[PDB]
Amino acid sequence: ASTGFAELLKDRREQVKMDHAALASLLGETPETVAAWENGEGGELTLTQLGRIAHVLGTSIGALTPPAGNDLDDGVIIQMPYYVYNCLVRTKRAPSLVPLVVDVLTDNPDDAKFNSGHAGNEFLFVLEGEIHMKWGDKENPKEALLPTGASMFVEEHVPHAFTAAKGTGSAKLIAVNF
Amino acid sequence: ASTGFAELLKDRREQVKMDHAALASLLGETPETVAAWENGEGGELTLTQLGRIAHVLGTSIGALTPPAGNDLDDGVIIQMPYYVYNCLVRTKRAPSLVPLVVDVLTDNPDDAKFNSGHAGNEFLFVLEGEIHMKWGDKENPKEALLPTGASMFVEEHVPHAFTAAKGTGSAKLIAVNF
Amino acid sequence: ASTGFAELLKDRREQVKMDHAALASLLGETPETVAAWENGEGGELTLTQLGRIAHVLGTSIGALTPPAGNDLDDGVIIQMPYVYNCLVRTKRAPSLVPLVVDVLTDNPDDAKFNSGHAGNEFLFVLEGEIHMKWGNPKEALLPTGASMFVEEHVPHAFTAAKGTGSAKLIAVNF
Amino acid sequence: ASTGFAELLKDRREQVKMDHAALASLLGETPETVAAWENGEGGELTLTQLGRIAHVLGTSIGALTPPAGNDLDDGVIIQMPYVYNCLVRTKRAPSLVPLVVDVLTDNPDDAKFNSGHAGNEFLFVLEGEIHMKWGNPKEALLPTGASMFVEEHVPHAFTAAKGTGSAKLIAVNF
Ligand SMILES: C[C@H](O)CP(=O)(O)O
Ligand SMILES: C[C@H](O)CP(=O)(O)O
């Protein structure tokens, strides 16, 4: 984080044609301190201070910090084996990827509590049982009965909810947010 | 396609400050014909001709044609239920999404024929049996044994191959390219 | 175009697990015809036909066609020297449209609005003084040397300052 | 920053099915502390600590922090008027760095190279004549009014034409 910030900070400062002294003057620091940050010593900078640094450099904290990181072994990562979520493999190389095996333990559609929508698309596959899906306007939603083997796609932000089909006991589906 | 091209063409032409006559002069057409295209009559234009139109407008055919389209019902789309691929739900709103249930009928790892890699990331989940996965350099690859319930992530372009574990008969996995 | 399409078609087809025959039936074509397109023989396909091919493959025409192309000389392109005088453009950055605009009207009371662009815009006052209007509009009198940024979709108009005759701006859309 | 982080933290946490206690244990914090961060009280978290929070949540610090912000006035920002004279910039388009460069060296034999930028660059010769070098370099003598495009990462240098004293360019990085 500190090494990444060090590199990114120096890139942005040079990009806006500021020297150490110029940047220091806008941040209540000495140019020696800014030089220190560009040397990896920014580790203890606060979120608040980071916001100010991003601001004077006309950018975001995100632009001054390193990407999530690489946790892959030559391109891949493997994970061994009302609602219980069994989280599947995730990776910093694709942060929005959140795959899950969901056991649905309520078979009363009236218990379907709607989301407000997701950032990111979602793919679903019914592994066991039958699912009663609802989506859209929670006040008056669309509905579908998804039997085992059915597959579904839910676009970003579309609110949804589901339970197992009425009186069918329980259902299991795999849900992949990407 | 014609209506979309009509709108996009007129947008680009105006964006580069060209009038009908100017654009027509670069394409061996009359300005009336270009006006016609911007009126939805470009339907019979050839791929070759489209390439030339994109070229003189300093852009790509893609920039002059409409996006894939919307096949969703209020945000969602549902599909009812050596290798056999059972294609799951797809959508033009997320073209790169290609989910599959793969039945692996060869349990001889020596039969694993490597890919050359995918455009797009890939999430996998072993539904049945045990999978013998290989990835990377086909000449000397990485390998892992994925039992039922295991989940895996393969980064874009990483070549891979798989069969069921030696002498285990057959395996089944769900593979989601996104 | 034909060769780029041949490569992208094959890739997409393989991507959706379709063999020549599978794709051909959906289009009402023979499998040899599809093989021919992937052999670079798709040059005469019409826009409408491309739309059908993209549709059955669940994608766009753009996803099956090559990028703009490269017109740079080792990464560079140069151009030697209301009236629009178009500056250098490149297929490597299509949305870049730099211009030298001659503003020949100096009656702000009669400026006309450009309902907004798709894309941001950077401007620099080359000569004279400009009277800019945007967004009961927001306004600004801008002397030579002044610079400005206009966000995508923001409507705006320009005129030379009241009775100053004319002015020049550099406008860079990107 | 604190409020943006509070919102993004909660969203990401919910996204990975973690309740306050689940996230707190991984960080060696109490669940009340996490609740406090989502209550906008994360202002004093250090860069290193943010790195740990992002790590356990399998994302980047950037994904948990707000966008640059808005400094426009109804979509517009203006700026009234080798030496770099910085023109208008905006947090709504951070990579836009327009400049008026005073080229005070007129000995091409002694130009020095900028090993390439991250991002494209558009240039326009304001005054005098420029001697550009890029990429045994490629070269070009550019009179006033000439314009040019330099693709990302392409090394380049500028000097006024041999013995012409000085020149001025407008360089727009985007
Ligand atoms: C829990 C929420 O109500 C449903 P999810 O997050 O699985 O989409
Ligand atoms: C068939 C190829 O060899 C493997 P896939 O396309 O499932 O990744």
Ligand SMILES: C[C@H](O)CP(=O)(O)O
């Ligand atoms: C400079 C101006 O932005 C040119 P217009 O938008 O009116 O085409």
Ligand SMILES: C[C@H](O)CP(=O)(O)O
């Ligand atoms: C105009 C030039 O591109 C400025 P530099 O790249 O040398 O910083």
Ligand SMILES: [Fe+2]
């Ligand atoms: Fe969901």
Ligand SMILES: [Fe+2]
């Ligand atoms: Fe694959």
Ligand SMILES: [Fe+2]
């Ligand atoms: Fe404009």
Ligand SMILES: [Fe+2]
């Ligand atoms: Fe440069």
